[PDB]
């Protein structure tokens, strides 16, 4: 799809980086009160991922991240695995004590 | 289930298209207060030109009239005139006045916007020059770009909802439209064209618009997307049987949504 | 290599106090094996469609698994398990076998 | 069996190509509701034009019909009309109505999509103007791009399979395929052209298509891949003995896939 | 030569920066073993510079 849409991996990576932050516009004074200008932008939905813009024609027809990829929820690389009683993987927690306590 | 908003543009009605060209070479006598961008209505004078091509034959007809030539000799010279390109309306001025017509006036054939106007005063005029390109927008054209991925769905769509940012009162339901045979290649998108009455001239070519689609598909076997274990070439799911044993099955996926 | 083949993290979604990793990667089928890597599809800057083998040789090899260092000197630890005997007898018997053989 | 997937484009069938041009100069009388991007069928009226080029010889033919001319003198004149451009169908109208033909209609020579439409109402028409470019998509074309280094992957016995993301409900049959003589210098890929049945016109030019190829190698010893250990300088497998004894054996790897 | 080849000093500096690093491709599982994907790229020869 990268070839079909003429979009490089590097371009995808860059688009992502510009689509997951919030910004502040200082504040504006209305009725002697302080109104904080707050701009959204945090990635928080799968759709939000899908609608990462990659390219746009003069027509105004955009090419989205959903066009070159599927966005899914998966597991991260496990750096630790825990098993309980030989009948299932589990999530655990350990309490570490300060040295002389 | 689908709920999507497709990018769309307002454009000229291409079935209301006119390119005005002289019928014979000549020179411009005067050009009227017009330019590309100006709105014109049918009958509006574009320019005045002199055309010497038909005078020799007009003489031929007038001479015929002085010497009472046959009725079929006259119909003949008259037919050679219209075949020579001389406008039927101008031919009438010939017979009515009994004088050779050299100065003519090209007018707008239809209501529309001048998008091209290549002739100004002091210029000669050729038959391949365009004096006026006029396009109409009363029945306005709106084209939407739809992601190819859902051609299987939009082929059977019932209705869309059309909205234009510049006009929040011209939002209407779209039940008629044509899904063009070709899809844009730069952006792999289907092209859906609809026609919208625009008597008030509210919708202008170049404006942005949105085409909304809220619909559901025909019933299919459904599973949670998280459940699909898909390599690039092998997609499967882990079914849980009666006893609760894991048994990976091979599946064929149609498409996912929401 | 780091993104198409490897699954290098690229960003993090913000979700209240929590944070979760975002990454980019080709489907596994493309990075299944050495031979797969030799055909890893690449869209060049000039939109040329090539494979990874067109710009690199991929070779299997052996090397460091993990570098244990003690006081800045490489070291390997041998883990011996004897529990029937007493320790001192075993260590002295090891010290002999080692010194002689 | 080597498996591999390649990106492909759905494009117009270039053996179903038509570019309509007037056989002689004249002027446009009328243009039908048509424009680039529209689908036309064989016989669809494109425009009406007036052509004065053939009227002299036509009338010359009609008078011979009066003055009892010979069939040879008649045919001989019809021949001048034919190699002067006048379409056979129109010449047939001349003989059937015994009337001079001045106004003509240009029709779509084939079923397909209009990719060019350079003439609009109000214009003159020239021999080199294209009134309509028409390209067909029934035996639609699908061109796949294979990186030059993997030329070996495609043989004559190779088994192909096509799918289009837009139509998951569609199993497409390949009519035939060809490996084009040259490589696209721009992308450094070999072009593999496939002809696909498209009677229902589900495959629109500009669409994406994934080409999967299966190719068989020369016979070689075959084992699973998890069964092979490779340390870079040596490859080995663990053999099981008649006794159940696990004995290692060195092997030489040829290639691997799937 | 920069003029003859139409290449700016800035372009040279940037090219250099992109030609002296190694990269990791995680690892791939073959024969139940872990194969670490390691990509070269370290400048280590004059030719490499050239």
Curated annotation (Swiss-Prot), chains B, D:
Induction cue: Transcriptionally regulated by CusR in response to copper and silver ions.
BP-aspect Gene Ontology terms: copper ion export; copper ion transmembrane transport; detoxification of copper ion; intracellular copper ion homeostasis; plasma membrane copper ion transport; response to copper ion; response to silver ion; response to toxic substance
Single GO MF annotation: transition metal ion binding
Disulfide bonds: none
Keyword Signal: yes
Entry's Gene Ontology cellular component terms: cell envelope; membrane; outer membrane-bounded periplasmic space
Keywords carried by this UniProt record: Copper, Copper transport, Ion transport, Signal, Transport
Subunit structure: The cus efflux system is composed of CusA, CusB, CusC and CusF.
Family label: Belongs to the membrane fusion protein (MFP) (TC 8.A.1) family.
UniProt function note: Part of a cation efflux system that mediates resistance to copper and silver.
Additional remark text: The cus system plays an important role in copper tolerance under anaerobic growth and, under extreme copper stress, in aerobic growth.
Protein name stated in the entry: Cation efflux system protein CusB
Organism of provenance: Escherichia coli (strain K12)
Name of the gene this protein is made from: cusB
Curated annotation (Swiss-Prot), chain C:
Effect noted on mutating residue 66 to I: Slight decrease in copper resistance
Compartments it resides in: Cell inner membrane
Expression triggers: Transcriptionally regulated by CusR in response to copper and silver ions.
Function: Part of a cation efflux system that mediates resistance to copper and silver.
Complexes and interactors: The cus efflux system is composed of CusA, CusB, CusC and CusF.
Family as reported in the entry's similarity comment: Belongs to the resistance-nodulation-cell division (RND) (TC 2.A.6) family.
Other facts: The cus system plays an important role in copper tolerance under anaerobic growth and, under extreme copper stress, in aerobic growth.
Protein's name according to its UniProt entry: Cation efflux system protein CusA
Organism: Escherichia coli (strain K12)
Residue numbers of the full-length protein present here: 747 to 847 of 1047
């Amino acid at each position: 799809r990268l070839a079909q849409y003429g979009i490089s991996l590097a371009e995808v990576k860059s688009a992502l980086d510009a689509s997951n932050q919030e910004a502040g516009g200082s504040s504006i004074e209305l009725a002697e009160a302080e109104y904080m200008v707050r701009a959204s932008g945090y990635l928080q939905t799968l759709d939000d991922f899908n609608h990462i813009v990659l390219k746009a024609s003069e027509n105004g027809v955009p090419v989205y991240l959903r066009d070159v990829a599927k966005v899914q929820i998966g597991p991260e690389m496990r750096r630790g695995i825990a098993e309980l009683n030989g009948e299932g993987e589990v999530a655990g927690g350990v309490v570490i004590l300060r040295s002389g306590k | 289930t689908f709920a999507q908003s497709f990018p769309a543009n307002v454009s000229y009605n291409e079935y209301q298209y006119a390119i005005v060209q002289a019928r014979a070479a000549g020179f411009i006598d005067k050009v009227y207060p017009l330019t590309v961008g100006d709105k014109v209505q049918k009958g509006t004078p574009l320019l005045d030109l002199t055309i010497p091509d038909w005078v020799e034959a007009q003489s031929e007809y007038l001479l015929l009239r002085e010497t009472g030539g046959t009725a079929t000799q006259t119909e003949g010279i008259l037919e050679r005139l219209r075949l020579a390109g001389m406008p039927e309306a101008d031919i009438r001025r010939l017979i009515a006045t009994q004088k050779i017509q050299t100065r003519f006036t090209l007018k707008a054939p239809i209501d529309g916007v001048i998008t091209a106007f290549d002739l100004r005063a002091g210029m000669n005029i050729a038959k391949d020059n365009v004096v006026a390109k006029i396009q109409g927008m009363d029945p306005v054209w709106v084209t939407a770009a739809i992601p190819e991925s859902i051609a299987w769905l939009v082929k059977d769509a019932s209705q869309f909802t059309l909205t234009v940012p510049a006009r929040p009162d011209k939002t209407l339901t779209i039940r008629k439209w044509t899904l063009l045979p070709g899809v844009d290649a730069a952006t792999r998108t289907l092209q859906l064209r609809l026609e919208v009455d625009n008597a008030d001239e509210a919708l202008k070519p170049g404006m942005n618009a949105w085409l909304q689609l809220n619909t559901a598909s025909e019933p299919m076997l459904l599973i949670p997307s998280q459940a699909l274990i898909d390599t690039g070439s092998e997609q499967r799911v882990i079914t849980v049987d009666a006893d609760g044993r894991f048994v990976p099955k091979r599946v064929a996926v149609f498409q996912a949504s929401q | 290599v780091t993104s198409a083949v490897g699954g290098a993290m690229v960003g993090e979604t913000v979700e209240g106090i929590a944070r979760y990793p975002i990454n980019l990667r080709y489907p596994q089928s493309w990075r299944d094996s050495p031979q797969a890597l030799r055909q890893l599809p690449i869209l060049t800057p000039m939109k040329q469609q090539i494979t990874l083998a067109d710009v690199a040789d991929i070779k299997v090899s052996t090397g460091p698994s993990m570098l244990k260092t003690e006081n800045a000197r490489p070291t390997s630890w041998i883990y011996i398990d004897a529990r029937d005997r007493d320790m001192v007898s075993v260590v002295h018997d090891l010290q002999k076998a080692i010194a002689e053989k």
